[PDB]
Write a protein that binds this ligand. Structure first.
Ligand SMILES: CN(C)CC[C@H](CSc1ccccc1)Nc1ccc(S(=O)(=O)NC(=O)c2ccc(N3CCN(Cc4ccccc4-c4ccc(Cl)cc4)CC3)cc2)cc1[N+](=O)[O-]
Ligand SMILES: [Cl-]
Length: 137
């Protein structure tokens, strides 16, 4: 379910680049918000991308550093969307550098963070149905 959302979002962003991974309302609303975040914040996106030096020995560190930064002042739906776009960017970028092996690992790190750290805020703020209600269509 957190798993499901992650795989869905990551599969989508990978597919938009021509790569193959290899609640529908929640899933669509999340993809759509990701597309829109990535355009509105395309400068922040490219600042990030051009400063990730991905290696497998630093990838977790890079993920954690950015995710800690992202939620440092609190959690809101927009930041949750940005969290998924970041993981998408990380995956796309790993494939570019021929570190395809990291994709499955990035998905695991993402689900764990959701499960451990984002879940209490999500449940307290109406769950994903409330996300859909506020930012769907
Ligand atoms: C009906 N529908 C068409 C309406 C669409 C509107 C506008 S689109 C959008 C804007 C921001 C985030 C997500 C989507 N939706 C919306 C509007 C507002 C909100 S919100 O109030 O809950 N949140 C925000 O407005 C918000 C949240 C985060 C945010 N960031 C901008 C800068 N980045 C940079 C950054 C800083 C620290 C660490 C990492 C990053 C970062 C993360 C990912 C990447 Cl790829 C690059 C850099 C972080 C988050 C900007 C705005 C959420 C949402 N929403 O979740 O859908
Ligand atoms: Cl906080």
């Amino acid at each position: 379910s957190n798993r499901e959302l992650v795989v869905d979002f990551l599969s989508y962003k990978l597919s938009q680049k021509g790569y193959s991974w290899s609640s529908e309302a929640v899933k669509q609303a999340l993809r759509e918000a990701g597309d829109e975040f990535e355009l509105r914040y395309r400068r922040a996106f490219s600042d990030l991308t051009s400063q990730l030096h991905i290696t497998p020995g630093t990838a977790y560190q890079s993920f954690e550093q950015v995710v800690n930064e992202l939620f440092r002042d609190g959690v809101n739906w927009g930041r949750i969307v940005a969290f998924f776009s970041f993981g998408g960017a990380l995956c796309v970028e790993s494939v570019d550098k021929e570190m395809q092996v990291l994709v499955s690992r990035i998905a695991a790190w993402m689900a764990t963070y959701l499960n451990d750290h984002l879940e209490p805020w999500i449940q307290e703020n109406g769950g994903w149905d409330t996300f859909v209600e506020l930012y769907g269509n």
